[PDB]
Structure formats: C-alpha cells, structure tokens
C-alpha cells in the first residue's frame, strides 16, 4: 500500500497578491524537483478522422476561460521539499460581464476569483521563463491531457489554437518536449491484462482517498503521486520489459 | 576596475556530473584547426570530425575559449558557430555555451564605469545569447536574467544606457523564434515596458531609437501595445 508523508498533502491557494511569491518558490525547486504534474479546470460547458475531436478543443480552448490551474512539483521518486508547499492552485480572474452563462445559471468561489484572480497574461510570463518550458530535463506529468495542453499552450502561445492536431502537436513538444500521459501509461498497463481514471488508478495503488484531492491543485497532486509510486514499482517498465518512454509525448 | 550590485542578473552553475579538463595542446589544434574551417557547406563533416575529438569532458573547455575569443569579437560568425552548437547535439555543451555567455555579460553590466565599458563586446555577447537560447526556441531563465525587473532597476539607478541596448539586443534574435516572436507573452511584456520608458524616461534619442527599430523587426509600432504601468 501507499502512504505519502503527511506534510506533501498541502495545497497552496495562489491569487494576484502571492502570484510572484510563489514563483519564485517554484523557481528555486525545479532542478531537483523536476517532475512537474498539470490539472486545470474551467466555466462553462464544452460546446457541440480524430480530426473531430480536435476541431471541437481547438474551439472550445478559443472561446472558453480556465479559472483554476493545479501545479504540483516532485522529483523522479516522488520526493517533495520539507518545507514550504510542493502543491499550488493558480485561481485566475472571473469577470461575469464578459461570461456568457450567469453565475446563478448552472465549488468555485466566483466572488474572489473576481476581486483576487490572478491575471492569466501575468502568470504566463511567469511560466515561461521558471524553468518548466522548454527544456528535456523537466519532465510533465498530464492524465488525459488534450484539454489540460490545449488550456495550458492557448496560454503560453498568447494566440488563436492552431488550424490542426499536427500544428497543434508541434507546439505542445516545443513548449513540453518530455511528458507523459499517465493515463494511456496506465491502459497500456491494463492491456498485459486482457476503468482506467485517476481514483480507480490511486485506488489500485493502495491509496487512501484523502480529501485533499477533490480540488484542482489536489488533482494534479494526485496524479504526481500515482505516476511517481506506479513508476517505482515497475522501474518504468512495461510488463514486456518496453520503457514508458516509448509513449513519451503522446496524449490521450 | 569598481563593480556595482547586479540585483536581477545572477550567474549560475553548470550541473554536471562530469570532470571538467583543460584540453591537452593535441586536442586544441585539431578543434580550432575545425573552427577555422568550417563553413556553412562543410558543416555536418567537420562537426562529426569535430566530435572524435572532442568530448564532454572538453565542453566547458571549448565553450570558454569559443564565447570569450570569437562570439565576443566575430559577430559575422555567429550562425555559424550557433549551427556547430547545435550540430553536436549536446545539451551540456549548450548549457556551457550559455553559462559563459552569462558570466561575459554579468561582469560587462556590472562594472561601475560606463566608459570602461567596451560597447562592441556588450552588443556581441547580447547578441550572441539571443543567437542560441530565443533563435533557438530555447527560454532565458529568470533565475538567470529577470528583464523586467531589470529595465525597472535600471530606471532608477540610471543604468538605461546601458541596460537598454543590451535588452534589445537579446530580444531582436526571437524576432524569426517562432515560439518568442509577439504575441508571446513573455516577449510582449518586456516590449510593453520598453513602450513605456520610451515615453516617460525622457531619455536620450539613441534610445527611443533602439527601442522603434527593435518593434520594426516585429514589425510593430510603439502604438501596437499598450505600456505598462511600472514606472513614476
């Protein structure tokens, strides 16, 4: 079974008064906590060839407004630091004269986002140059990404989403040149067996369902944990003896 | 020569597992007999002929003597010395390339003495760093170099002169960058504090010059981007 230390279950809410505070946190941990795990989540609802699927992301990611972003950071053993949070969920601005559906209208604290909310233009400068982009020796952790990439390169880019799941794909290995999509990991993993989400995987690991999980930061917690513990356990191997590494890259 | 406090640009370290060694002289002349040679035609053949002599205990070797006596001084050479970088596939040899950038560059902005400061070797270095990090797709980190804080600090101490060209310089290589290139954000958010120290600095004109014909090579204008609210 799996009982991560009690001092790694600790999520550090960001809002505009602690954004540049925490980056610089984040940028003194990278080096040696280099295994770095993404959640997010957003407003309203998704709107109406895996080229139809991408067409739909694209314009969606277009259109739609994240509100929260979960960053956890570990190193290759799922160590964390001692002291100070590991864990941070980013809670960007929410203007309700500019969403489309009420707030009224079909967990989010939209009153503080408004007044608090991080600016999403500052926390991508941020981003760009603490050590997370573009470099191979950081290593990103996703689970079920296409929507968390889409969300997290529209940010990065500061652009329209590109025209194609190729265009789009060449932006993604740019920005994130080594990552891992824990759960196509964990079906292939399945499949030298024959559900696949997150809590039936942290579940299968032994792992007490903590209630510091259920938000956004918690879920990108959650996944660092479990694809840190689930990669210890087989040494970053297959079942056939193949290493991750051969899905390096690839999302869904 | 008096240095000043550098609060925004720290030098860092190389992690390297590796013995760093002075090349031995047989060494020596067979890489710089290859610098020395090497065009934009014979490039992938003098760098494999490059590699069977060079070896990673010799990066940190080779970077030194490559930014301090050539990128420093040759900035007709410097895609060319840019490509053999990237030709030897070496992200170890890249992150000496670019610590000793940084450690060129830190004592230049450094000394106290503007007149002590040679100008043409300021330009090279900035140049050259943009050459193989933003050119490249590859970040300048902020550890390493924090740009806005930098043009804001450099505000008040009166250092813009100086700091000025020296930013522009770097960011005109992002300027073919497809990643760095407007609308990124980092890069946009530099220009928008140069937009506005262009107008509230009350500089001299070589500046306002620098910054228009840095916004040109994005094709921009200082009307193109709102400024930021910074400085009072």
Same mark, same amino acid.
């Given at each position: 079974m799996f009982l991560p230390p009690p001092n790694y279950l600790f999520v550090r809410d960001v809002w505009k008064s602690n954004l540049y505070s925490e980056f610089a946190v984040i940028r003194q941990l990278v080096s040696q906590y280099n295994h770095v795990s993404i959640s997010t989540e957003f407003v309203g609802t998704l709107a109406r060839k895996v080229d139809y699927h991408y067409q739909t992301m694209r314009a969606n990611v277009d259109f739609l407004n994240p509100i929260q972003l979960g960053l956890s950071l570990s190193d290759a053993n799922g160590n964390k630091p001692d002291n100070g949070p590991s864990t941070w969920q980013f809670n960007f601005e929410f203007d309700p004269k500019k969403e489309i559906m009420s707030t009224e209208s079909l967990g989010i604290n939209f009153e503080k986002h408004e007044n608090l909310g991080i600016d999403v233009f500052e926390f991508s400068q941020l981003l760009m140059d603490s050590g997370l982009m573009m470099d191979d020796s950081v290593t990103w952790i996703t689970y079920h990404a296409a929507y968390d990439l889409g969300f997290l390169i529209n940010i990065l880019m %500061?652009?329209?989403?590109? %025209? %194609?799941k190729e265009d789009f794909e060449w932006w993604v290995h740019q920005y994130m040149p080594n990552f891992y999509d824990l759960n196509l990991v964990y079906k292939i993993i399945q499949e030298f067996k024959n559900q696949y989400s997150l809590t039936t995987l942290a579940d299968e690991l032994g792992l007490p369902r903590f209630s510091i999980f259920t938000t956004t930061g918690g879920q990108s917690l959650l996944m660092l944990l479990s694809f840190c513990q689930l990669s210890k356990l087989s040494m970053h191997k297959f079942p056939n003896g193949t290493d991750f590494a051969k899905y390096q890259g690839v999302i869904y | 020569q008096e240095m000043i406090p550098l609060k925004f640009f720290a030098v860092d370290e190389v992690s390297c597992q590796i013995n760093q060694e002075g090349a031995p002289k047989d060494v020596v002349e067979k890489v710089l007999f290859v610098l020395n040679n090497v065009t934009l035609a014979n490039l992938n053949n003098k760098v494999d002929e490059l590699k069977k002599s060079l070896t990673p205990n010799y990066f940190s070797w080779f970077s030194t003597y490559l930014v301090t006596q050539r990128a420093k001084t040759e900035p007709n050479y410097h895609d060319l010395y840019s490509k053999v970088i990237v030709a030897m596939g070496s992200g170890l040899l890249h992150q000496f390339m670019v610590n000793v950038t940084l450690r060129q560059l830190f004592v230049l902005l450094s000394t106290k003495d503007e007149q002590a400061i040679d100008k043409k070797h300021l330009k090279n270095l900035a140049s050259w760093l943009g050459c193989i990090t933003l050119a490249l797709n590859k970040p300048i980190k902020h550890k390493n170099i924090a740009f806005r804080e930098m043009l804001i600090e450099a505000y008040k101490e009166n250092r813009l002169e100086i700091v000025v060209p020296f930013v522009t310089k770097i960011l005109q290589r992002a300027s073919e960058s497809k990643i760095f290139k407007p609308p990124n954000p980092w890069t946009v958010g530099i220009l928008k504090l140069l937009i506005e120290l262009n107008e509230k600095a009350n500089w001299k004109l070589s500046l306002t010059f620098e910054v228009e014909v840095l916004l040109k090579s994005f094709n921009? /204008? /200082?009307?193109?981007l709102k400024p930021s609210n910074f400085i009072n």
């Open positions: %500061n652009d329209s989403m590109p %025209n %194609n | 921009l /204008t /200082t009307k193109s």
